[PDB]
Swiss-Prot record, chain B:
It is found in: Mitochondrion matrix. ATP binds at G1, V2, G3, K4, T5. Homohexamer. Organized in a ring with a central cavity. The ATP-binding and proteolytic domains (AP-domain) form a hexameric chamber, while the N-terminal domain is arranged as a trimer of dimers. DNA and RNA binding is stimulated by substrate and inhibited by ATP binding. Interacts with TWNK and mitochondrial DNA polymerase subunit POLG. ATP-dependent serine protease that mediates the selective degradation of misfolded, unassembled or oxidatively damaged polypeptides as well as certain short-lived regulatory proteins in the mitochondrial matrix. Endogenous substrates include mitochondrial steroidogenic acute regulatory (StAR) protein, DELE1, helicase Twinkle (TWNK) and the large ribosomal subunit protein MRPL32/bL32m. MRPL32/bL32m is protected from degradation by LONP1 when it is bound to a nucleic acid (RNA), but TWNK is not. May also have a chaperone function in the assembly of inner membrane protein complexes. It is linked to CODAS syndrome: A rare syndrome characterized by the combination of cerebral, ocular, dental, auricular, and skeletal features. These include developmental delay, craniofacial anomalies, cataracts, ptosis, median nasal groove, delayed tooth eruption, hearing loss, short stature, delayed epiphyseal ossification, metaphyseal hip dysplasia, and vertebral coronal clefts. Disulfide bonds: none annotated. Belongs to the peptidase S16 family. Duodenum, heart, lung and liver, but not thymus. This is Lon protease homolog, mitochondrial. The Lon N-terminal domains are crucial for the overall structure of the protein, maintaining it in a conformation allowing its proper functioning. The AP-domain (ATP-binding and proteolytic domains) has a closed-ring conformation in the presence of AMP-PNP and its N-terminal entry gate appears closed. Upon ADP binding, it switches to a lock-washer conformation and its N-terminal gate opens. It comes from Homo sapiens (Human). It comes from the Eukaryota. The lineage of its organism: Eukaryota, Metazoa, Chordata, Craniata, Vertebrata.
Length: 62, 62
C-alpha cells in the first residue's frame, strides 16, 4: 500500500523506457525511428537485466 | 513486386484453407520460430503459434 506506484513498481527497466520516451518526446521524432525505438524497448522487456546482450541493447538505444 | 504473395493468397482461396505469411528475411535468431521458454516475463511464442491461432485451423496455407 505504501508503494502507490513507488519502488518495486518501476522494475528498473520500464524506468529506462520512460526516460527514453520523455527524452525524445520534446523531439519531433521521425515515425520510422519511433517504431524502431518501440522495437528496441520491446526487446528490452524481452531480455533480462543481467546479461551482455541486454547491455548492448541498452547502449544502442542510448 | 511480382505478386508471389498474391499467388499464395489466390492458392489459399482456391484451397479453402486460411492464408498466413511469415518473414524469415535476414533473421538469425531461431527464437522467433521457437518463441521463448515462457519462463521469462516477456517471453513470447514463436510466430507459428500466432499464425495457427489467427488462421483458426490446423490445415492453413503458410
Ligand atoms: N500476374 C499478375 N496478376 C495479378 N496481379 C499481379 C500480377 N503480378 C503482380 N500482381 C500484383 O502484385 C501485388 C503483390 O505483389 P507481391 O506479391 O508483394 O510481389 P512479390 O511477389 O515480388 O513480393 C498484388 O496486388 C497483385 O495484384
Amino acid at each position: 500500500i505504501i508503494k502507490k506506484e513507488l519502488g518495486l513498481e518501476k522494475d528498473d527497466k520500464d524506468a529506462i523506457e520512460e526516460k527514453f520516451r520523455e527524452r525524445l518526446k520534446e523531439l519531433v521524432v521521425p515515425k520510422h525511428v519511433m517504431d524502431v525505438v518501440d522495437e528496441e524497448l520491446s526487446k528490452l522487456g524481452l531480455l533480462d537485466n543481467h546479461s551482455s546482450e541486454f547491455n548492448v541493447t541498452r547502449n544502442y538505444l542510448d | 513486386g511480382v505478386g508471389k504473395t498474391s499467388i499464395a493468397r489466390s492458392i489459399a482461396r482456391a484451397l479453402n484453407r486460411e492464408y498466413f505469411r511469415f518473414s524469415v528475411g535476414g533473421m538469425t535468431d531461431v527464437a522467433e520460430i521457437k518463441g521463448h521458454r515462457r519462463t521469462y516475463v516477456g517471453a513470447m511464442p514463436g510466430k507459428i503459434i500466432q499464425c495457427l491461432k489467427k488462421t483458426k485451423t490446423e490445415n492453413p496455407l503458410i
